[PDB]
């Protein structure tokens, strides 16, 4: 097939990665706001840690769901269960491009006939959520800055932090749009056709 | 998702926090009308200290009781034993028009009870201290109280004009905040 | 006490008022993005008019459904069909507070006994939808400005319109929030 | 809702709008490259005009066919001809979402059932091509700039034009990507 993301995350079950990379990002958000870093997230005393984690996760998902070159599995072949005919829509999946295949209850559902059972494999273009050490630097900068900005604004309101972050976010956001101009916006309009 | 307030204050029993952050805000009110700061709020004498503290508390409650992103818990769970659930001093409001406070206890008015089969998940507004809210809100609250304290007891004109400008600026910033974060509904 | 909303709209059968007030509010959204006003909302079949009207309706219902001093009736008594014993939950009703009565059909369904059907006898806190000339000016301005901003953003994307409308919405919200704090608690 | 595109274009006969908005966009491509504007798009004569118009149409179709909040009708109802059962797949139609219905030879074709004839109306999610004055400003700027760059690159090769157009495209794309994330 085609190019894949750095992380496949096939066994992700929770909303969060629970990783060193996620901790580092949350610790950056805390720092921005004047709070000292923690050694684990998991574990679950403070409101500020929990809130930063949540804000970060939502922004991460919102930006990644658009779909970009680094988080796209260009030609993913999905094979149904032999007995049930089912294909799980796994928790790390953000979207199947095209408007035909959607998540219904944790299962890939085909709108062309109205079914979640398949007699053979399907090949689709899939967006898979990546962790912060699995994306280009410009994306980690845009997501973690945007999250820091929101965390500041919602709970703290330090204006020097806001002015500073607004500028860093603008710059990362321009860099991510320059990326997309180089790599292209995937459109479903196999790998060869994916021409756009 | 769900985000919580920075302060939970479950063991708050009085009307006041009694914190350093409270003292700093009262001291700003006193400075605004030319009185000197105090090192504690534990009843000192001083009618001006007491009055500032009370005006500040009332304005704080009034503003915070509207419900804002920073003091709303969208999924707070309250477990009742005796069936009963206390409505604590830090609770301002449970949104939605079903549960309310009956002399210190949560009253479920879908059934007219205040005893509960299990536990409940509600949307709850909880009073935050001055170091637990965004700067714009502290500014609005503290400036509004300062102005009220001036007008009620002193009436200095240059204070009034100055505070009025600051209150208006804070109030715009708080309305911008809510446009960014949204008003909760249901 | 008991004060009532200015509009009860019992005969309202579809989603829209169809009123002169609605027409004015739509013409205002049209003026904001540079289009000409219309003389009626009974189109054919201008897309812009249909879209403005839907967006405006949705925002109106959304903001009003919170419940405010101007659109709550703390003791609305509703009376059944008798025969069927059935109480409609009408287009103009946004919600019944308290947690017991809810919209099944709509009807009206007592979620604490059965039961779609009633002997008489029912008194209730009702939030009812007001028309654009039946609310305080600040709420009309909020609803219309917010609707105008969604209409712009989705279909037009004019940056100066957005900036200007955003400061108008903020002004309206500042007045509605004073209203909410003044009448509430 | 319930919301519909600004333009339905049910009577478009060919690939092009023929409109003042189309003319103005082609004139902008001509200006980017140092050529004078024209008063109309079919005379013809002009190779540059014909090529700019084709490039612009192709880019316009390609970007729009993704489907956006401004050009999706979530419940378009299409009604078959009574005698024939057929439903034309019109030139302004870009796609029908879901994987069931496609354009086969100019007719709406249900590829799941394996039929292009229908006993009554169908209601579908239709993406319909908008004119340059019927889309949000950031999309017109994206499409016209992109088209300008392809026209330059293929026939002119002016490097200063490419550098300046590439900045303006990036700026437009940034606004269109905020739109996509805001309306997604």
Author numbering:
A (entry chain A): -8 to 180, 185 to 189, 191 to 192
B (entry chain D): -8 to 71, 74 to 179
C (entry chain C): -8 to 176
D (entry chain B): -8 to 175
What do the authors of the reporting publication say about this deposited model?
The KP32 bacteriophage belongs to the Caudovirales family and can infect multidrug resistant K. pneumoniae isolates. Analysis of the KP32 genome revealed the presence of three tail proteins that are predicted to be involved in the bacterial infection machinery: tail tubular protein A (TTPA), tail tubular protein B (TTPB), and tail fiber protein (TFP). TTPA is a structural protein that is located in the bacteriophage tail core; it is necessary for the adhesion of the phage to the bacterial cell wall, which is a prerequisite for host infection. Interestingly, although TTPA is considered a structural protein, it also possesses the depolymerase activity described in this paper.
All four monomers are folded almost identically. The TTPA molecule consists of 192 amino acid residues; in the electron density map, however, all of the chains have an additional nine expression-plasmid-derived amino acids at the N-terminus (numbered −8 to 0). The electron density maps are interpretable for amino acid residues −8 to 175 of chain B and −8 to 176 for chains C and D. Thus, about 15 residues at the C-termini of chains B, C, and D are not seen in the crystal structure. In chain A, most of the C-terminal part (except for residues 181–184) is visible and forms a well-defined α-helix. The solvent water molecules were classified on the basis of electron density and B factors into 885 fully occupied and 10 half-occupied sites. The structure was refined at a resolution of 1.9 Å to an R factor of 18.3% and an R free of 22.8% in an isotropic mode. However, the TTPA molecule has an additional domain consisting of two antiparallel β-sheets and loops, which lacks in gp11 and gp4. Moreover, the crystallized TTPA molecules adopt a tetrameric structure in which the helical domains are directed toward one another to generate the hydrophobic core, while the loop/β-sheet regions are directed to the outside; thus, there is relatively limited contact between monomers. Our Phyre2 server analysis (confidence 67.3% and identity 21%) showed that the antiparallel β-sheet region (residues 57–99) of TTPA may contain a lectin-like domain; as such domains interact with oligosaccharides, this finding suggests that TTPA could display glucanase activity. We therefore propose that the D121-X-D123 and D151-X-E153 residues of TTPA may be good candidate catalytic residues.
